[PDB]
């Protein structure tokens, strides 16, 4: 039955008014079916007859589809929703399972007719009006309006869930031990009691509810631990995502590939190791959700390694606020980083990965940081506090980088983990020029049009070189120019560019890049013993750049 | 209080709709704080709980203002503001005295606690709504909406403006020379007295306020000099500078003049008359970098001349009150940070540098956040309006920690950059 639950006052957007979408008279038996149901709902108060003294309308539909044991009513409300005020977004963020506390016993009450039980603001009922048709062309006019929360109107979940909370509160207070979590139609009641008395509370909670016209599972329960919720396998002491099947074929379209990837990430939560820098690597450069893509080699390899992992079942443990959050990160390889948050040795609260940034030049230390970050953020949202990191980097290799980094940072507390791969300084540029070391005045330039370029240098020692280049841009040459000097320079060198770009890039001390070249200009940086890079202005900036500006 | 006053009808901008902003996640610690704070306000009737018919939302943070044992609620009305105050920058605009910046000392004291007495226009409350978060988003946020003029809200000072120039009037009556500026929650009292004389004049005001309008500023130190105390004194007459100086030296090298012709050439963008072509001609050769060389003649007439064009500030540099202030900061090193407040490229209206400690408490973040609040205040004083900071920090990071050392009641408007490169030698 309906409740003595005071209603939430609703309004229609400004200026706007009630919807008048007239009914398309239609099908005798179904044109009775509604009347068969309407007069049944109307009995229970869910609805009420109305003269056409006032209102508008909405499309009433009769629809049967199941194993056909009864037909069901339906009312498209869209032209109404389109006119109703906004409410407080219900499910902002779903709680992540990795941060829930174990409960000895947990039951799920299936609040059923929910909506039709909560009432509806008296002055906003006039709009829910609809009309079931005549036998055929002679409108007799079976007119009713809703007194409860109509089946698909905007302000419904909100006002429903809003009303539930209010109803629970006395109980939730007369029993500060029963944690109730209402999600949509469900009610998950957890606690730490003897299964006997835990059954009591449920029945009590259950009887409470019923006194406000709300009803619940009379099979006294309807709990199927683990619970299938939002894509999780929720046990009372662990969690996962069972149906995690990544099918195979010999045809992979932007569609299926995405879908595979998606499914793969989702697993990252608890499945230690999953990778995706390969199956996605493909995507950019297209927007054809039906275009066949060649499952590249790494893609085939990675997809396997994900199967190996996934082939064997892994679980997730819950949160104990009694202990410390530890989170630790390890590097995988292709700008890939994984991690897991534990409070215990062989247990895991969650696991995850971190993919690099811009399709260009980054750095192992920087990344490790963006990771500690990604996690610090995540952690705050789930457990409300930051975790104690453990990481593959020594106070030295780290502190050195930020001290030199033009950008501010703040890594919470951490402890060293001597488990490789390790994050380190693969090289450093000298801060002051190198006395003795030959000086290479490098430079370059290419034709934006012809795409033909030159890369060369001229040393103080009077040494020169100019090398031709095809399929190249002003930038790629200026780098080639450096790569060149480094190549011909001795174990110690001073390079001099007019390109702010090439400078900056190298300066960032990138460990890796997606530009075959930079990886080269690094490979050598690393080899070299002492290197000094210096910047001078382009043309008016014709310092030692007098010779290298056009001979090159 | 308990005295219903005529509410000043508030209406957002034209065809504007209230704010709907994401309430960032918080530590459990701070949630407990906020919950505590609000549960009390709800009792003093300041705020109430709302229903789902209230779709609006403005963010909230918990911070400690005077590091004092307990917290303070800090509501980020940066959004409800643009949606209103900009016609409450008009409707009830609060005028900015161009001399306060000239005073010898400007003590800054809070007054936000005054507002909590003026009830808010019933049909506006629906906009001051905020949400206290749930950890892991378990429960539904707690939902509250304001009933008195909210603090972070640049519309309370505008409404109260009246009740204030009154209380303050029989004080400016006597001490006339002292200028008083009100910017939102704070009061900026400026004088020219001798430190101690001033500091006394302030306390003289503190109690005026306190006693007359029950308003309640606060006492800097609590009658105790632990050698770790302050009172928020600004000395505006002290600021203006030229941290931009070519290094004067005896012997120069190729790499020394090089890096010099570099900056010097760059400087050209900001400073009008600056030619370097003869000093640079001294570089046209492919000479080693360590090789020392002395300064030419027409060249030596440049370092000498330009060193001097670096003492006479730009010209067309005027304050366009139509445009807003932009503040760029750059990590300098060992707790040092330089900064510019321009309005259009290279037309800085002010450059200074923060640096408070490098080795002990020095935290890349805690520095910047403080640097930000400093740079702000200066402008709130100089121009009576906060700038838009271009912070050299990663968004997520800053979003996580600013609230840790943010002690001010207002919150500027920031955005995160890529990498100041050569603009770092603005040191
Ligand atoms: C995952 C199972 C569970 C545990 C381990 N602990 C709880 O406290 C709880 N609820 C009683 C309260 C949840 O409060 C936020 C649930 C039920 C549930 C069912 C589906 C989804 C979730 C997040 C929890
Ligand atoms: Mn060039």
Coordinates of N, CA and C in Angstrom, one line a residue, chain A residues 169-341:
Chain A
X169 N 16.1 5.8 8.6 CA 16.7 6.5 9.8 C 16.2 6.1 11.2
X170 N 14.9 6.0 11.4 CA 14.6 5.6 12.8 C 15.4 4.3 13.1
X171 N 15.0 3.3 12.4 CA 15.6 2.0 12.5 C 17.1 2.1 12.5
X172 N 17.7 2.7 11.5 CA 19.2 2.8 11.4 C 19.7 3.4 12.7
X173 N 18.8 4.0 13.5 CA 19.3 4.6 14.8 C 19.0 3.7 16.0
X174 N 17.8 3.0 15.9 CA 17.5 2.1 17.0 C 18.4 0.8 16.9
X175 N 19.3 0.8 15.9 CA 20.2 -0.3 15.7 C 21.5 0.1 15.1
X176 N 22.3 1.0 15.8 CA 23.6 1.5 15.3 C 24.6 0.4 15.0
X177 N 24.1 -0.8 14.6 CA 25.0 -1.9 14.4 C 24.8 -2.6 13.0
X178 N 23.6 -2.3 12.5 CA 23.2 -2.8 11.2 C 23.5 -1.8 10.1
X179 N 24.6 -2.1 9.3 CA 24.9 -1.1 8.2 C 24.0 -1.5 7.0
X180 N 23.2 -0.6 6.6 CA 22.3 -0.7 5.4 C 22.9 0.1 4.3
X181 N 22.9 -0.5 3.1 CA 23.3 0.2 1.9 C 22.3 0.0 0.8
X182 N 21.6 1.1 0.5 CA 20.5 1.0 -0.5 C 21.0 1.3 -1.9
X183 N 20.9 0.4 -2.8 CA 21.3 0.6 -4.2 C 20.1 0.3 -5.1
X184 N 19.5 1.3 -5.7 CA 18.4 1.2 -6.6 C 17.1 0.7 -5.9
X185 N 16.9 -0.6 -6.2 CA 15.7 -1.3 -5.6 C 16.2 -2.2 -4.4
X186 N 17.4 -2.6 -4.5 CA 18.0 -3.4 -3.4 C 18.3 -2.7 -2.1
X187 N 18.5 -3.5 -1.1 CA 18.9 -3.0 0.3 C 19.8 -4.1 0.8
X188 N 21.1 -3.8 0.9 CA 22.1 -4.8 1.4 C 22.4 -4.5 2.9
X189 N 21.9 -5.4 3.7 CA 22.1 -5.3 5.2 C 23.3 -6.1 5.7
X190 N 24.4 -5.5 6.1 CA 25.5 -6.3 6.7 C 25.6 -6.0 8.2
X191 N 26.2 -7.0 8.8 CA 26.5 -6.9 10.3 C 27.4 -8.0 10.8
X192 N 27.7 -7.9 12.1 CA 28.6 -8.9 12.7 C 27.8 -9.4 13.9
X193 N 26.8 -10.3 13.6 CA 26.0 -10.9 14.6 C 25.9 -12.4 14.3
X194 N 25.3 -13.2 15.3 CA 25.1 -14.6 15.2 C 24.0 -14.8 14.2
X195 N 24.2 -15.5 13.1 CA 23.2 -15.7 12.1 C 21.8 -15.8 12.6
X196 N 21.6 -16.2 13.8 CA 20.3 -16.3 14.4 C 19.7 -14.9 14.5
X197 N 20.3 -14.1 15.4 CA 19.9 -12.7 15.7 C 20.1 -11.7 14.5
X198 N 20.9 -12.1 13.5 CA 21.1 -11.3 12.3 C 19.8 -11.5 11.5
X199 N 19.2 -12.6 11.6 CA 18.0 -12.9 10.9 C 16.9 -12.1 11.5
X200 N 17.0 -11.9 12.8 CA 16.0 -11.1 13.6 C 16.0 -9.7 12.9
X201 N 17.1 -9.0 13.1 CA 17.2 -7.6 12.6 C 16.6 -7.5 11.2
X202 N 17.0 -8.5 10.3 CA 16.4 -8.4 9.0 C 14.9 -8.4 9.0
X203 N 14.3 -9.3 9.8 CA 12.9 -9.3 9.9 C 12.4 -8.1 10.5
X204 N 13.1 -7.5 11.5 CA 12.7 -6.3 12.1 C 12.7 -5.2 11.0
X205 N 13.9 -5.1 10.4 CA 14.1 -4.1 9.4 C 13.0 -4.3 8.4
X206 N 12.7 -5.6 8.1 CA 11.7 -6.0 7.2 C 10.3 -5.6 7.6
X207 N 10.0 -5.7 8.9 CA 8.7 -5.4 9.3 C 8.6 -3.9 9.4
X208 N 9.7 -3.2 9.7 CA 9.7 -1.8 9.8 C 9.2 -1.3 8.4
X209 N 10.0 -1.6 7.4 CA 9.6 -1.3 6.0 C 8.2 -1.5 5.8
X210 N 7.7 -2.7 5.9 CA 6.3 -3.0 5.6 C 5.3 -2.0 6.2
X211 N 5.6 -1.4 7.3 CA 4.6 -0.4 7.9 C 4.6 0.9 7.2
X212 N 5.4 1.0 6.2 CA 5.4 2.2 5.3 C 5.1 1.8 3.9
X213 N 4.2 0.9 3.8 CA 3.8 0.4 2.5 C 4.8 -0.3 1.7
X214 N 6.0 -0.6 2.2 CA 7.1 -1.2 1.4 C 7.1 -2.7 1.7
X215 N 7.4 -3.5 0.7 CA 7.5 -5.0 0.9 C 8.8 -5.6 0.5
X216 N 9.1 -6.8 1.1 CA 10.4 -7.5 0.8 C 10.3 -9.0 0.7
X217 N 11.3 -9.7 0.1 CA 11.4 -11.1 -0.1 C 10.9 -11.9 1.1
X218 N 9.7 -12.6 0.8 CA 9.1 -13.4 1.8 C 9.6 -14.8 1.9
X219 N 10.5 -15.2 1.0 CA 11.2 -16.5 1.0 C 12.2 -16.2 2.2
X220 N 11.7 -15.2 3.0 CA 12.3 -14.6 4.2 C 13.7 -14.1 3.9
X221 N 14.2 -14.4 2.7 CA 15.5 -13.9 2.2 C 15.5 -14.2 0.7
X222 N 16.5 -13.6 0.0 CA 16.7 -13.8 -1.4 C 18.1 -13.5 -1.8
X223 N 19.0 -13.9 -0.8 CA 20.4 -13.7 -0.9 C 21.2 -14.8 -1.6
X224 N 21.9 -14.5 -2.7 CA 22.7 -15.5 -3.4 C 24.2 -15.2 -3.4
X225 N 24.8 -15.1 -2.2 CA 26.3 -14.8 -2.1 C 27.0 -15.8 -3.0
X226 N 27.9 -15.3 -3.8 CA 28.3 -13.9 -4.0 C 27.2 -13.2 -4.8
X227 N 27.2 -11.9 -4.6 CA 26.2 -11.0 -5.2 C 26.7 -10.5 -6.6
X228 N 25.9 -10.5 -7.6 CA 26.3 -10.0 -8.9 C 25.9 -8.5 -8.9
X229 N 26.8 -7.6 -8.7 CA 26.6 -6.2 -8.6 C 27.5 -5.4 -9.4
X230 N 27.0 -4.5 -10.2 CA 27.9 -3.6 -11.0 C 29.1 -4.2 -11.6
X231 N 29.0 -5.5 -11.9 CA 30.1 -6.2 -12.6 C 31.1 -6.8 -11.6
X232 N 30.6 -7.0 -10.3 CA 31.5 -7.6 -9.3 C 31.0 -8.9 -8.8
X233 N 31.9 -9.7 -8.2 CA 31.4 -11.0 -7.6 C 31.7 -10.7 -6.2
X234 N 30.6 -10.3 -5.5 CA 30.7 -10.0 -4.1 C 30.4 -11.0 -3.0
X235 N 31.4 -11.6 -2.5 CA 31.3 -12.7 -1.4 C 31.3 -11.9 -0.1
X236 N 31.1 -12.6 1.0 CA 31.1 -11.8 2.3 C 32.5 -11.6 2.8
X237 N 33.5 -12.2 2.1 CA 34.9 -12.0 2.6 C 35.9 -11.9 1.5
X238 N 35.5 -11.7 0.2 CA 36.3 -11.5 -0.9 C 35.6 -10.9 -2.1
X239 N 36.2 -10.7 -3.2 CA 35.5 -10.1 -4.4 C 36.3 -10.3 -5.7
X240 N 35.6 -10.2 -6.8 CA 36.2 -10.3 -8.2 C 35.3 -9.9 -9.3
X241 N 35.4 -10.5 -10.4 CA 34.6 -10.2 -11.6 C 34.4 -11.4 -12.5
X242 N 34.1 -12.6 -12.0 CA 34.0 -13.8 -12.7 C 33.8 -13.8 -14.2
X243 N 32.6 -13.4 -14.8 CA 32.5 -13.4 -16.2 C 33.5 -12.5 -16.9
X244 N 34.7 -12.9 -16.9 CA 35.8 -12.1 -17.6 C 36.4 -12.9 -18.7
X245 N 35.5 -13.1 -19.8 CA 35.9 -13.9 -21.0 C 36.2 -13.1 -22.2
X246 N 37.5 -13.1 -22.6 CA 37.9 -12.4 -23.8 C 38.0 -13.3 -25.0
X247 N 36.9 -13.5 -25.7 CA 36.8 -14.4 -26.9 C 37.9 -14.2 -27.9
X248 N 38.0 -15.1 -28.8 CA 39.0 -15.0 -29.9 C 38.4 -15.2 -31.3
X249 N 39.2 -14.7 -32.3 CA 38.8 -14.9 -33.6 C 40.0 -14.7 -34.5
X250 N 39.8 -14.4 -35.8 CA 40.8 -14.2 -36.8 C 40.4 -12.9 -37.6
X251 N 39.5 -12.2 -36.9 CA 39.0 -10.9 -37.4 C 38.8 -9.9 -36.2
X252 N 39.5 -8.8 -36.2 CA 39.4 -7.9 -35.1 C 39.2 -6.4 -35.6
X253 N 37.9 -6.0 -35.4 CA 37.5 -4.6 -35.8 C 37.7 -3.6 -34.7
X254 N 37.7 -2.3 -35.0 CA 37.8 -1.3 -34.0 C 36.8 -1.6 -32.9
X255 N 35.7 -2.2 -33.3 CA 34.7 -2.6 -32.3 C 35.2 -3.6 -31.3
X256 N 35.3 -4.8 -31.8 CA 35.8 -6.0 -30.9 C 37.1 -5.7 -30.2
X257 N 38.0 -4.9 -30.8 CA 39.3 -4.6 -30.2 C 39.0 -3.8 -28.9
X258 N 38.2 -2.7 -29.1 CA 37.9 -1.8 -28.0 C 37.3 -2.7 -26.8
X259 N 36.2 -3.3 -27.2 CA 35.5 -4.2 -26.3 C 36.4 -5.2 -25.5
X260 N 37.4 -5.7 -26.2 CA 38.4 -6.6 -25.6 C 39.1 -5.8 -24.5
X261 N 39.7 -4.7 -25.0 CA 40.5 -3.8 -24.1 C 39.7 -3.4 -22.9
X262 N 38.5 -2.8 -23.1 CA 37.6 -2.5 -22.0 C 37.6 -3.6 -21.0
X263 N 37.1 -4.7 -21.4 CA 37.0 -5.9 -20.5 C 38.3 -6.2 -19.8
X264 N 39.4 -6.0 -20.5 CA 40.8 -6.2 -20.0 C 41.1 -5.2 -18.8
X265 N 40.8 -3.9 -19.0 CA 41.1 -3.0 -17.9 C 40.3 -3.4 -16.7
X266 N 39.0 -3.4 -16.8 CA 38.1 -3.8 -15.7 C 38.8 -4.9 -14.9
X267 N 39.5 -5.8 -15.5 CA 40.2 -6.9 -14.8 C 41.4 -6.4 -14.0
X268 N 42.0 -5.3 -14.5 CA 43.2 -4.7 -13.9 C 43.0 -4.5 -12.4
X269 N 41.8 -4.2 -11.9 CA 41.5 -4.0 -10.5 C 42.2 -5.0 -9.6
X270 N 42.0 -6.2 -9.9 CA 42.5 -7.3 -9.0 C 43.5 -8.3 -9.7
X271 N 43.4 -8.4 -11.0 CA 44.3 -9.3 -11.8 C 45.7 -8.8 -12.1
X272 N 46.6 -9.1 -11.2 CA 48.0 -8.7 -11.2 C 48.8 -8.9 -12.6
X273 N 49.1 -7.8 -13.2 CA 49.8 -7.9 -14.5 C 49.2 -7.6 -15.8
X274 N 47.9 -7.6 -15.9 CA 47.2 -7.3 -17.2 C 47.9 -6.2 -17.9
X275 N 48.0 -6.2 -19.3 CA 48.6 -5.2 -20.1 C 47.7 -4.8 -21.2
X276 N 47.9 -3.6 -21.8 CA 47.1 -3.2 -22.9 C 47.8 -2.1 -23.8
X277 N 49.0 -1.8 -23.5 CA 49.7 -0.9 -24.3 C 49.9 -1.3 -25.8
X278 N 49.5 -2.6 -26.1 CA 49.6 -3.1 -27.4 C 48.3 -3.2 -28.2
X279 N 47.3 -3.7 -27.6 CA 46.0 -3.9 -28.3 C 45.3 -2.5 -28.5
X280 N 45.7 -1.5 -27.8 CA 45.2 -0.2 -27.9 C 46.1 0.7 -28.9
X281 N 47.4 0.4 -28.7 CA 48.4 1.1 -29.5 C 47.9 1.3 -30.9
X282 N 47.1 0.3 -31.4 CA 46.6 0.2 -32.7 C 45.6 1.3 -32.9
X283 N 44.5 1.4 -32.1 CA 43.4 2.4 -32.3 C 43.7 3.8 -32.9
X284 N 44.4 4.7 -32.2 CA 44.6 6.0 -32.8 C 44.7 6.0 -34.3
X285 N 44.2 7.0 -35.0 CA 44.3 7.1 -36.4 C 43.1 6.5 -37.2
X286 N 42.0 6.3 -36.5 CA 40.8 5.8 -37.0 C 39.6 6.0 -36.1
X287 N 38.4 6.0 -36.8 CA 37.1 6.2 -36.1 C 36.1 5.4 -36.8
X288 N 36.5 4.2 -37.3 CA 35.6 3.3 -38.0 C 35.3 2.0 -37.2
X289 N 34.2 2.1 -36.5 CA 33.8 1.0 -35.6 C 33.4 -0.3 -36.3
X290 N 33.9 -0.6 -37.5 CA 33.5 -1.8 -38.2 C 34.7 -2.1 -39.2
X291 N 35.8 -1.3 -39.1 CA 36.9 -1.5 -39.9 C 37.9 -2.6 -39.3
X292 N 38.2 -3.6 -40.2 CA 39.1 -4.6 -39.7 C 40.6 -4.2 -39.5
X293 N 41.1 -4.5 -38.3 CA 42.5 -4.2 -37.9 C 43.3 -5.4 -37.8
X294 N 44.6 -5.4 -38.4 CA 45.5 -6.5 -38.3 C 46.0 -6.7 -36.9
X295 N 45.6 -7.8 -36.3 CA 46.1 -8.1 -34.9 C 47.6 -8.2 -34.9
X296 N 48.3 -7.1 -34.8 CA 49.8 -7.0 -34.8 C 50.4 -8.1 -33.9
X297 N 51.7 -8.3 -34.0 CA 52.4 -9.4 -33.3 C 52.4 -9.2 -31.8
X298 N 52.7 -8.0 -31.3 CA 52.8 -7.8 -29.9 C 51.4 -7.9 -29.3
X299 N 50.4 -7.4 -30.1 CA 49.0 -7.5 -29.8 C 48.6 -9.0 -29.5
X300 N 49.1 -9.9 -30.4 CA 48.8 -11.3 -30.3 C 49.5 -11.9 -29.1
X301 N 50.8 -11.4 -28.9 CA 51.5 -11.8 -27.7 C 50.9 -11.3 -26.4
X302 N 50.7 -10.0 -26.3 CA 50.1 -9.5 -25.1 C 48.7 -10.2 -24.7
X303 N 47.9 -10.3 -25.7 CA 46.6 -10.9 -25.5 C 46.7 -12.3 -24.9
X304 N 47.8 -13.0 -25.2 CA 48.1 -14.3 -24.7 C 48.4 -14.2 -23.2
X305 N 49.4 -13.3 -22.9 CA 49.9 -13.1 -21.6 C 48.8 -12.7 -20.6
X306 N 47.7 -12.1 -21.2 CA 46.6 -11.7 -20.4 C 45.8 -12.9 -20.1
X307 N 45.7 -13.8 -21.1 CA 45.0 -15.0 -21.0 C 45.7 -15.9 -19.9
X308 N 47.0 -16.0 -20.0 CA 47.7 -16.8 -19.0 C 47.3 -16.4 -17.7
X309 N 47.4 -15.1 -17.4 CA 47.0 -14.5 -16.1 C 45.6 -15.0 -15.8
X310 N 44.6 -14.3 -16.5 CA 43.2 -14.6 -16.4 C 42.8 -16.0 -16.4
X311 N 43.5 -16.9 -17.1 CA 43.1 -18.3 -17.1 C 42.9 -18.9 -15.7
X312 N 43.8 -18.4 -14.7 CA 43.7 -18.8 -13.3 C 43.1 -17.7 -12.5
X313 N 42.0 -18.1 -11.7 CA 41.3 -17.3 -10.8 C 42.0 -16.6 -9.6
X314 N 41.8 -15.3 -9.5 CA 42.4 -14.5 -8.5 C 41.3 -13.7 -7.7
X315 N 41.5 -13.6 -6.4 CA 40.5 -12.9 -5.5 C 41.0 -11.6 -4.9
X316 N 40.1 -10.9 -4.3 CA 40.4 -9.6 -3.7 C 39.9 -9.7 -2.2
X317 N 40.7 -9.2 -1.3 CA 40.3 -9.2 0.1 C 39.7 -7.8 0.4
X318 N 39.2 -7.7 1.7 CA 38.5 -6.4 2.1 C 39.4 -5.5 3.0
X319 N 38.8 -4.4 3.3 CA 39.5 -3.4 4.2 C 39.3 -3.5 5.6
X320 N 40.5 -3.5 6.3 CA 40.5 -3.5 7.8 C 41.2 -2.1 8.2
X321 N 40.4 -1.2 8.7 CA 40.9 0.1 9.1 C 41.8 0.1 10.3
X322 N 42.0 -1.1 10.8 CA 42.9 -1.4 11.9 C 44.4 -1.4 11.5
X323 N 44.6 -1.6 10.3 CA 46.0 -1.6 9.8 C 46.4 -0.5 8.8
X324 N 47.6 -0.6 8.2 CA 48.1 0.3 7.3 C 48.0 0.0 5.8
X325 N 47.7 1.0 5.1 CA 47.6 0.9 3.6 C 49.0 0.9 3.0
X326 N 49.3 -0.2 2.3 CA 50.6 -0.2 1.7 C 50.2 -0.3 0.2
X327 N 51.0 0.4 -0.6 CA 50.7 0.3 -2.0 C 52.1 0.3 -2.6
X328 N 52.4 -0.6 -3.6 CA 53.7 -0.7 -4.1 C 53.6 -0.8 -5.6
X329 N 54.6 -0.2 -6.3 CA 54.6 -0.1 -7.7 C 55.9 -0.7 -8.3
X330 N 55.7 -1.4 -9.4 CA 56.8 -2.1 -10.1 C 56.7 -1.6 -11.6
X331 N 57.8 -1.5 -12.3 CA 57.7 -1.1 -13.7 C 57.6 -2.4 -14.6
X332 N 56.9 -2.3 -15.7 CA 56.7 -3.4 -16.5 C 57.6 -3.3 -17.8
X333 N 57.6 -2.2 -18.4 CA 58.4 -2.0 -19.6 C 58.2 -0.9 -20.6
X334 N 57.2 -1.1 -21.5 CA 56.9 -0.1 -22.5 C 56.1 1.1 -21.8
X335 N 56.7 1.8 -20.9 CA 56.1 2.9 -20.3 C 54.9 2.4 -19.4
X336 N 55.0 1.1 -19.1 CA 54.0 0.4 -18.3 C 54.4 0.2 -16.9
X337 N 53.4 0.5 -16.0 CA 53.6 0.4 -14.5 C 52.5 -0.3 -13.8
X338 N 52.7 -1.2 -12.9 CA 51.6 -1.9 -12.2 C 51.8 -1.7 -10.7
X339 N 50.8 -2.1 -10.0 CA 50.9 -1.9 -8.6 C 49.7 -2.6 -7.9
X340 N 49.8 -2.7 -6.6 CA 48.8 -3.3 -5.8 C 48.8 -2.7 -4.4
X341 N 47.6 -2.6 -3.8 CA 47.4 -2.1 -2.4 C 47.1 -3.1 -1.4

